[PDB]
Design a protein around this ligand. Structure first.
Ligand SMILES: Nc1ncnc2c1ncn2[C@@H]1O[C@H](COP(=O)(O)OP(=O)(O)O)[C@@H](O)[C@H]1O
Lengths: 50, 50, 1144
């Protein structure tokens, strides 16, 4: 009752969240970077860290 | 040893020998040209760290 | 008669108004000239103070000083730079009694308290010969200081007084001095012996300034420790300030622990004011003092933490605001302010009306309309107030366009009823004094518009019927234009949340079904289709982001370098250099023109230059050293020696600006010798170029300065004898040796700041000389440097530390696409700074506006790219902030560290880093190198750090930096000498003139002999000799089959080479001199005596005007889609075959 099982989905959730934190800092700096009026939500986020 | 891909081994001791003999030859030339002293002070510092 | 009486009372205020720009300076000049007594101007801030510091001297003649404020922040961690302290107390020494003079102090200083005067009148002595003081007065002042009368002085704390002669042996120095008072005056300063009593030196003013503003000795130390144990608590720490001072040594900010070094209350500097002093005010105190005090307190409890270095309450280190406004009722005070007070006694408004709209523009046909329509209708005198002397001539022909004559006067009172005068000074703004109808007009009163231009917005003018007038009955699937992006297919209205605001929007589908939801509110951006092709309408893709277009696949090696470099090096090592001739007294008279004295290392560098110049060998000397160490006058003495031997000195720099300073330097130094010195760049007109470069062949210009324009394959020096090249680490290799290609045994001297790794290694390997310099003549500063992580409050406090010093900040970002955003990102981070934008890609007039307004302190912080690297003046700039020092070359890191400084002020330099594990390892090595070395003389070893992290580049190629697995230097030397004796083996013509006599056959096609076909560069070299010296197709084919015999097949670069040589044969056979070709076509340029059938060439022109146009008499532009280079070769081949079939 003090040790719990975290199975497959929960660890994949945590790894996906770590990747999400990296890409949100990246897209945060990209969004704080200007020229938003010609921007898209595809060049701003990058699929490499996920 | 060649790494079979066109280059050589890493072999860090040859790297350190190359570095030390570079500093030694450079300092020898520097004393040959009779530089003002404050240059050759920190070059002797650099050779000692090498 | 003057205009207004003055405040002469204990605490009266005198209100003065109607004051526009820069009028206050001449007003207080009037004040000083009318009041027998001191004038202390209180400034609202450093900047205005410093600005007023050159304003007031423009208008009057009295001695004017600042008080040197401590440069630091309140409770900072920095020493105030003892030299400044030495200036500070010195003024503070004479501040108790100074009869006439103007002192500008700011509220930052005036709220600060100072030393209790006991230490100053005891433990210090400045004394000048023109001080009318008696014998027993100084005797009892030494007694009050505590000194002992010994009539044969030897000890610290002694003085003598016998008859008229007085002697003194101080705390400060180890020597006594004889005074010899006469007629209640001092009449000798005789440095006499400790025992032998005869004079060493006759002085006028003795300067025994204490090493600190505070007592430093032992009794001070235990007094301080008594105070600290009374106030704070002592912890066992070997860095705590109590133990630190207890060891005798000092930390940085120790002075901000002021009062513990006296154990007295501290005077508010009002004690140092003279008897009837006149305080004059500017702007107001009632504002700035408040927010300064608020900043002071906010900083105090911001650092009212940290038992490591605790602080005193600010009530001791400063007055309080109410305390100020109490002591400001102790002095007769003047308040100048920029509006109209109505009416009362002790109050006057003086007519100082601001100037009318006088401005220039190139848009109007006659630019000086406002001035030309103002001056005839201005009944009074007109003054022109140019800052600079040469800028005076910038006004001289300018008002000559309106035919109006400036006379140079000195004094503002020199005005007549109506006359036009120029004034050399330091003003910034003009006005009209309607009391006497006088008008002062600054230079900056001409260019009021620092304005940009707008663009785009086309369909916002298209209010036509296609806009649909916001019908709101539009159907689904309607192709609809939205003017920022293009046409989409309208797919209904949809509600969406937007951060606590629900809304209704028009969903619109563009290409790749990307939705766009404009609000229903701004429905007017949305227009119905106009093309009538509603079922054939296109679709725009949103965003238009086509960066992907940066992929890959560009080739290289269109032209080999290695053979040609070996050729020029062999040609240099074959012939002999020029043995120059040296004249003792003629060179000495040139040395006399130097108004300075050489530092000894500089002298022996100059001596090594001359004692290599005068030799049969060829000079090749690196004169490496730090910037500002006196490099140029070495080149002066070199050139003079060169130019008297009539050898046509050539100067090369890599920018227009450095050429511009060099033109001044050369012309001003060579002000007495029959030498003509000129420059060339893109700034020179072609009609000036076409005579300068032509005259170079004639050669009465002996010294020529310029950019790459010299190396443009047309400049022909009649007798080249000296190459001087400045700011080395540019120029590739080709531009570096392209000049030496002209003359094999020319002498080369290369100045630099930090040499590139290739020329460093080649110099250190005995190929070129090296002469290092150090020891700058003026004691310059090692501007403390830091490498810290990015931090919003760190950069803020850096900006604040600079701006409350008063100078300006170079803040460099080096990305032009987002520098506009980074401007406001910095601007609301520091709301009280003034930020303008400058980069190299503006419209080349706003840039100069920004830099000149910067030069006139109109704003504080400049956001910039590396345009500032071109090395501009303005030493008031004193802080570099490189925002992303991750991606910046280490040599120009040192160069940018050289940009700040240039002053007795302590400059600063913060190098912002990203997070350390994020960056490249090479960046970490660079930053550790720059954090290791912060000195003077460290520029060179920093270049030894530039080398050996990147690899010194290949000795026989381009690419100055790189490992590259090059040719070994021993093998390099062997190949070199093999080329040498094979060259001098039978007097073989240099390959370079085989370039010149060859017809221009450029075709933008890779034509060379590749290294795999021939490894030996001598063999490839002699093959190049044999092909370009071959004059028959028979010999070309024999060489070709010999190549085939030696190495198997013939590759395409070899084949193309050989057929271009074939083409050169008939080009020189007909007279086809200049042939350029490309993908698009090219230019055939014939000789003046050409073998062109003229009527048949006209027949070509009239059968295909699209592929034959004579644009010029022998210039034939042919336009051909030469997609395949084989088709290009056969096209030109069959074309000249046609032309030889029509040859006459
Ligand atoms: N021997 C000297 N004595 C006094 N001042 C010198 C001496 N040599 C150089 N200076 C000063 O240093 C500056 C020299 O800089 P210069 O050689 O023109 O270019 P750099 O700034 O690259 O060294 C000059 O302004 C000069 O006043």
């Amino acid at each position: 009752g003090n040790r719990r099982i975290r199975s497959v989905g929960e660890m994949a959730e945590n790894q996906f969240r770590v990747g999400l934190v990296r890409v949100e800092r990246a897209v945060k700096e990209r969004l704080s970077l200007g020229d938003l009026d010609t921007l898209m939500p595809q060049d701003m986020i990058n699929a490499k860290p996920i | 040893v060649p790494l079979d891909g066109g280059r050589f081994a890493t072999s860090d001791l040859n790297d350190l020998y190359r570095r030390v003999i570079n500093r030694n030859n450079r300092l020898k030339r520097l004393l040959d040209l009779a530089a003002p002293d404050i240059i050759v002070r920190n070059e002797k510092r650099m050779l000692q760290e090498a | 008669q003057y205009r207004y009486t003055l405040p002469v009372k204990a605490g009266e205020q005198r209100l003065l108004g109607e004051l526009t720009g820069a009028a206050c300076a001449t007003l207080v000049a009037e004040i000083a000239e009318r009041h027998a007594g001191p004038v202390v101007l209180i400034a609202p801030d450093m900047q205005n103070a410093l600005r007023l510091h050159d304003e007031i001297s423009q208008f009057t003649d009295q001695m004017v000083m600042n008080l040197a404020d401590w440069e630091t922040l309140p409770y900072d961690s920095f020493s105030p730079h003892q030299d400044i302290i030495s200036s500070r107390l010195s003024t503070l020494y004479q501040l108790p009694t100074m009869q006439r003079g103007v002192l500008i102090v700011p509220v930052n200083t005036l709220m600060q308290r100072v030393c209790p005067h006991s230490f100053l009148h005891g433990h210090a002595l400045v004394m000048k010969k023109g001080q009318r003081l008696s014998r027993d007065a100084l005797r009892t002042q030494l007694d009050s200081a505590g000194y002992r009368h010994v009539d044969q002085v030897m000890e610290h704390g002694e003085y003598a007084t016998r008859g008229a002669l007085l002697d003194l042996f101080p705390m400060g120095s180890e020597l006594p001095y004889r005074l010899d008072f006469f007629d209640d005056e001092i009449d000798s300063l005789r440095v006499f012996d400790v025992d032998s009593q005869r004079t060493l030196e006759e002085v006028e003013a003795i300067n025994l300034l204490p090493a600190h503003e505070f007592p430093t000795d032992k009794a001070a130390i235990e007094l301080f420790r008594s105070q600290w144990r009374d106030t704070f608590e002592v912890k066992r720490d070997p860095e705590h300030i109590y133990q630190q001072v207890s060891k005798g040594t000092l930390p940085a900010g120790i002075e901000y622990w002021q009062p513990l070094f006296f154990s007295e209350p501290l005077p508010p500097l009002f004690s140092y004011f003279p008897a009837n002093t006149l305080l004059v005010n500017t702007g107001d105190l009632e504002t700035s003092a408040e927010r300064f005090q608020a900043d002071t307190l906010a900083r105090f409890e911001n650092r009212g933490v940290d038992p490591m270095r605790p602080l005193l309450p600010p009530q001791s280190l400063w007055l309080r605001v109410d305390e100020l406004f109490s002591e400001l009722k102790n002095w007769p005070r003047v308040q100048l302010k920029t509006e109209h007070l109505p009416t009362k006694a002790a109050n006057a408004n003086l007519g100082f009306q601001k100037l009318p709209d006088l401005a220039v523009q190139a848009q109007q046909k006659a630019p000086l309309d406002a001035l030309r329509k103002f001056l005839e209708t201005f009944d009074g005198p007109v003054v022109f107030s140019v800052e600079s002397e040469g800028r005076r001539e910038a006004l001289g022909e300018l008002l000559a366009r309106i035919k109006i004559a400036p006379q140079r006067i000195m004094r503002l009172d020199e005005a007549s009823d109506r006359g036009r005068y120029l004034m050399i000074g330091a003003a910034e703004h003009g006005f009209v004094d309607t009391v006497r109808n006088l008008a002062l007009i600054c230079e900056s009163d001409l260019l009021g518009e620092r304005v940009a231009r707008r663009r785009q917005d086309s369909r916002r003018t298209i209010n036509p019927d296609t806009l649909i007038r916001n019908l709101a009955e539009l159907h689904i699937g309607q192709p609809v234009v939205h003017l920022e992006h293009g046409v989409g297919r309208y797919a209904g209205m949809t509600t969406l949340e937007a951060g606590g605001i629900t809304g209704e929007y028009l969903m619109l589908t563009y290409a790749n079904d990307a939705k766009l939801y404009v609000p229903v509110s701004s429905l007017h951006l949305i227009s119905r289709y106009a093309g009538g092709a509603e079922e054939n309408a296109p679709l725009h893709k949103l965003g238009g982001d086509a960066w992907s277009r940066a992929r890959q696949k560009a080739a290289e090696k269109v032209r080999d370098v290695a053979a040609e470099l070996l050729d020029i090096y062999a040609q240099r090592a074959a012939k002999e250099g020029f043995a120059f001739k040296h004249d003792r007294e003629q060179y000495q008279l040139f040395c006399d023109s130097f108004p300075f004295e050489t530092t000894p290392d500089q002298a022996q560098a100059i001596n090594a230059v001359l004692s290599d110049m005068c030799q049969p060998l060829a000079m090749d000397r690196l004169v490496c050293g730090d910037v500002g160490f006196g490099k140029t006058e070495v080149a002066m003495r070199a050139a003079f020696l060169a130019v008297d031997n009539h050898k046509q000195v050539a100067v090369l720099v890599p920018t227009t600006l450095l050429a511009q300073q060099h033109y001044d330097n050369f012309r001003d130094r060579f002000a007495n010798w029959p030498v003509r010195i000129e420059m060339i760049s893109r700034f020179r007109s072609a009609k000036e170029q076409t005579q300068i470069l032509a005259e170079v062949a004639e050669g009465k210009i002996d010294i020529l300065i310029g950019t790459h324009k010299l190396l443009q394959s047309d400049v022909k020096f009649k007798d080249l004898g000296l190459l001087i090249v400045d700011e080395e680490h540019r120029f590739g290799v080709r531009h570096k040796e392209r000049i030496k290609a002209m003359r094999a045994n020319v002498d080369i001297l290369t100045l630099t700041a930090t040499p590139i790794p290739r020329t460093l290694n080649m110099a250190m390997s005995g190929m070129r000389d090296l002469s290092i310099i150090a020891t700058p003549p003026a004691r310059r500063l090692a501007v403390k440097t830091f490498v810290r992580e990015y931090d919003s409050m760190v950069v803020r406090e850096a900006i604040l530390r600079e701006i409350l010093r008063g100078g300006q900040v170079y803040y460099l970002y080096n990305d032009v696409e987002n520098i506009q955003k980074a401007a406001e990102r910095l601007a609301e981070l520091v709301p009280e700074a003034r930020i303008a934008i400058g980069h190299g890609q503006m419209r080349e007039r706003e840039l100069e506006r920004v830099m000149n307004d910067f030069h006139h302190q109109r704003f504080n912080v400049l956001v910039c790219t590396t345009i500032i690297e071109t090395g501009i003046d303005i030493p008031t700039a004193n802080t570099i902030i490189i925002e992303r020092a991750d991606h910046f070359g280490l040599a120009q890191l040192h160069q940018l560290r050289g940009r700040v400084g240039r002053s007795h002020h302590q400059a600063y330099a913060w190098l912002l880093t990203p997070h350390p594990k994020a960056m490249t390892t090479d960046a970490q090595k660079r930053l550790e190198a720059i954090a290791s070395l912060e000195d003077l003389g460290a520029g060179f070893a920093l270049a030894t750090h530039d080398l050996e992290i990147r690899g010194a580049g290949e000795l026989l190629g381009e690419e100055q930096s790189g490992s590259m697995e090059t040719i070994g230097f021993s093998l390099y030397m062997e190949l070199l000498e093999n080329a040498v004796d094979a060259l001098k083996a039978g007097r073989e013509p240099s390959l370079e003139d085989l370039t010149s006599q060859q017809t221009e056959v450029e075709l933008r096609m890779p034509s060379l002999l590749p290294d795999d076909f021939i490894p030996d560069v001598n063999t490839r070299l002699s093959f190049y000799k044999r092909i370009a010296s071959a004059k028959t197709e028979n010999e070309l084919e024999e060489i070709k089959v010999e190549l085939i015999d030696r190495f198997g097949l013939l590759p395409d670069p070899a084949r193309t080479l050989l057929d271009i040589a074939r083409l050169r044969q008939q080009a020189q056979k007909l007279g086809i001199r200049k042939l350029e070709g490309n993908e698009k076509g090219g230019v055939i340029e014939f000789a003046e005596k050409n073998h062109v059938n003229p009527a048949w060439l006209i027949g070509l022109l009239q059968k295909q005007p699209q592929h034959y146009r004579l644009d010029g008499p022998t210039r034939l532009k042919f336009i051909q889609d030469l997609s395949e280079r084989k088709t290009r070769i056969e096209w030109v081949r069959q074309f000249m075959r046609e032309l030889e079939e029509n040859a006459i």
